């Protein structure tokens, strides 16, 4: 005769640029894309903070700049482009200034627990990045299909 | 009291890449855009003519190639791109081998009646174009808004 | 006087983010002909379209319990004043957007 | 006395598309032709033609 068979599959753990736990976090609205496009799991620099109006003009991280926060994942604000989710010019952003988020990584080795995070020129985590941050790792280290992700603990500037 | 007013405005003569008159004309189907996009008011080139099936591979004019026909305006086959009417890669094209048509122009002086038509590298009519064509002018010379149009009589190759 | 001097419509539903409107045009000509002409002019047409977007605003305010009790016992509530300020801020921000615009938001 | 004329073209696919979307093209083309005739008559009345005397 025949022997019946059963299969089992486990879902992934996380997707790029999404929150990790329900710990204390502080997301910031009232942020505008001054120029260009911002990926969901990437660092963000502040070009200028308005005095009277109060909006903060943000931009993608570049060389010789201090990171401020990381964009997060939302199904309403984000625009569908480049086979992913991005924030377009002249639109609001949800930037996380504190908490734990799943970032994008160009690294190939698992990190430690309480070491400082280093970012490269385009705002993605790298083992030997030139840009130094005050954030620390959190322990999470997984990947989604062909995309590598890492968990990072952010602190307020 | 007041004096009534009445105004008067005349329509434009023609649009780029449209059949000028009802004289003897021939439009050839079974032509597929091998590569790139083709503007409506521009010439084409024959990359290859299949020996068994019958389809002719058409492409935009390049340096040192003989023109074969001019695309024709249609509200169904064409696809709107760059705020213009265009033919995309794949699909079918409508190129006329004989007749009269309005064509895109770059020259600034009105041409004579029975003179040969010269084309540039990109397939648009020009007074001093390098490419020499057996087609002759028809006398039509108009301008739609900011687009210059010229009427050209085509002959079968 | 932004809403007073300019018309107000109600087409868009709350959930939309964009809208579109279109226009059309035509060209043509005519000529004097004779018998056995075999040559006549032609006509055509065209059209275009455009787009737009939508935004969101918000603010907030705070109050404590002792302030509420003091307001109830003196005939001078503070919650009403704070809510009036909150609504006025929205109205003035809409007016600012209408008559001056914001460069970063395009 | 004199005489005037013009014409227009259309295919089957355009007709079917117009019937299936509620934006007929034949009506627009006919209106364009009639307007061209009226405007040419006005031009003859108010400006005249030199070659035709």
């Amino acid at each position: 005769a025949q022997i019946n068979a059963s299969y089992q599959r486990d879902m992934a753990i996380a997707l790029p640029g999404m929150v990790a736990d329900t710990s204390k976090y502080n997301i910031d609205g009232a942020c505008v894309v001054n120029e260009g496009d911002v990926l969901v799991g990437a660092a963000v620099q502040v070009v200028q903070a308005q005095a009277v109006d109060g909006h903060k003009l943000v931009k993608a991280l570049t060389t010789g700049t201090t990171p401020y926060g990381v964009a997060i994942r939302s199904h309403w604000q984000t625009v569908n482009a480049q086979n992913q989710m991005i924030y377009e010019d002249g639109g609001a952003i949800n930037v996380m200034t504190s908490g734990r988020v799943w970032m994008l990584s160009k690294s190939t080795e698992a990190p430690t627990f309480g070491s400082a995070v280093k970012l490269d020129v385009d705002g993605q985590e790298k083992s030997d990045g030139t840009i130094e941050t005050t954030w620390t790792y959190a322990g999470g280290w997984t990947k989604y299909k062909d995309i590598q992700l890492v968990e990072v603990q952010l602190h307020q500037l | 009291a007041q004096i009534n007013a009445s105004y008067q405005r005349d329509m434009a003569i023609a649009l780029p890449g449209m059949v000028a008159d009802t004289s003897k004309y021939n439009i050839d189907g079974a032509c597929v855009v091998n590569e790139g996009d083709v503007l409506v008011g521009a010439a084409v080139q024959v990359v290859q003519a299949q020996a068994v099936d019958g389809h002719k591979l058409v492409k935009a004019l390049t340096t040192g190639t003989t023109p074969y026909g001019v695309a024709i305006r249609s509200h169904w086959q064409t696809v709107n791109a760059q705020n213009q009417m265009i033919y995309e890669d794949g699909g079918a094209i409508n190129v006329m081998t004989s007749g009269r048509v309005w064509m895109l122009s770059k020259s600034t002086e009105a041409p004579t009646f029975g003179s040969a038509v010269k084309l540039d590298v990109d397939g648009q009519e020009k007074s001093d174009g390098t490419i020499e064509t057996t087609w002759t002018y028809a006398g039509g010379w108009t301008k739609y808004k900011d687009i210059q149009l010229v009427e050209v009589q085509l002959h079968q190759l | 006087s932004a809403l007073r001097v300019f018309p107000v419509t109600t087409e868009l539903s709350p959930t939309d983010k964009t809208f579109e409107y279109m226009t059309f045009d035509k060209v043509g000509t005519a000529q004097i002909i004779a018998d056995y002409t075999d040559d006549l002019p032609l006509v055509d047409a065209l059209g275009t379209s455009e787009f737009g977007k939508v935004f969101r605003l918000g603010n907030a305010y705070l109050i404590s319990i002792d302030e509420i009790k003091a307001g109830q016992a003196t005939g001078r509530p503070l919650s009403t004043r704070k809510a009036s300020a909150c609504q006025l801020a929205h109205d003035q921000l809409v007016n600012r957007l209408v008559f001056k615009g914001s460069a970063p938001h395009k | 006395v004199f005489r005037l004329g013009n014409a227009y073209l259309i295919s089957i696919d355009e007709i079917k598309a117009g019937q299936a979307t509620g934006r007929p093209l034949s009506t627009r083309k006919a209106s364009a032709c009639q307007l061209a005739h009226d405007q040419l008559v006005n031009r003859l009345v108010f400006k005249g033609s030199a070659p035709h005397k």
């Binding site: 790029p16 309403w76 086979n83 992913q84 299909k145 | - | 579109e20 279109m22 226009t23 | 009226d38």
Partner: peptide, 28 residues
Amino acid sequence: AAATMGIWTAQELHRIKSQSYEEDYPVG
């Protein structure tokens, strides 16, 4: 290069206004 897009498309939140504008050409 995997697809990590959202759930809703751009045409699900979009409105086409009923009115259309047609230019006029006076006869005379």
